A paper describes a structure:
[name] from the earthworm [name] is a pore-forming protein that specifically interacts with sphingomyelin (SM) and may confer innate immunity against parasites by attacking their membranes (Bruhn et al., 2006; Cooper et al., 2001). The structure reveals that [name] has two domains. The topology of the [name] structural fold establishes it as a member of the aerolysin family of pore-forming proteins (Szczesny et al., 2011), which appears thus to be conserved from bacteria to annelids. Here we report the crystal structure of [name] alone, and in complex with the sphingomyelin headgroup phosphocholine (POC), and with SM itself.
Residue numbers in the entry: 6 to 298
The structure:
Amino acid sequence: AEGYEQIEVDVVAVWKEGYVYENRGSTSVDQKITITKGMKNVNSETRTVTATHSIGSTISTGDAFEIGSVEVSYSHSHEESQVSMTETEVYESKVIEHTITIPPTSKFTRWQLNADVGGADIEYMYLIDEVTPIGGTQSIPQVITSRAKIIVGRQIILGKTEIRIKHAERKEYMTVVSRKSWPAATLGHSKLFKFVLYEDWGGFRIKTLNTMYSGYEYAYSSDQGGIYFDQGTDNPKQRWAINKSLPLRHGDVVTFMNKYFTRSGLCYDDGPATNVYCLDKREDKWILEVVGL
Ligand SMILES: [Cl-]
Ligand SMILES: [Mg+2]
Ligand code: NA
Ligand code: NA
Ligand code: NA
Ligand code: NA
């Protein structure tokens, strides 16, 4: 799969008390109970969901992911069962309605199973409805295993994966042009200009694969503020700090903070020739885009 990657991740699920009615009378009662299966406040145009909280080690808050297939293992009355919910089921929100006649001196209980895929509250994954006499005992349904397959951006291998660095606000790729007398970063529409990321003891590095002057390839911050590409050195001016934890992924919105100039970070600022600068108290958003075209 070139582009994105599927990962099975452990999700939290729960058996709620979906509806309760207690018929303390001597006559039977009719009740029109209505439920809504599927993901709550689901977006009609896109299937991509942004996380409101983490999903173990793979997902963290803000990460954009896609479902998938939620699978829950549970038990009710000493019998273990497995309920699955396919892609079209989790996104299409169905409304189910049926009458239920509660007998006299009894209680109707509708157990509702819900899953929480990193904020995505999937309502009524399954249903168990039991009638018990007053004052009888119930069988509380217990969840055993809750997992879900999710599709996320493919993993960026440091040193191998060729990428493009696009600005989040302006929506333009980082290109390399000659400023003064060495290669300097600017912003344009060219897709031919790629990069490759590395990580060492000093930090992250932005190597360009389209250098004008051979050897001068690692992105660094000059004293004047501008961005230039220089030869491989331990100099912290050419190392960087990425806000997102490893492993990095395709389509990740990241920010590059210089290791030498701690407060200063990679951003856009229309200068004399170039427009990609590293300025104090500024940290513009950049999207990592993996190449397969
Ligand atoms: Cl030079
Ligand atoms: Mg619980
Ligand atoms: Na798993
Ligand atoms: Na659970
Ligand atoms: Na109870
Ligand atoms: Na920004």
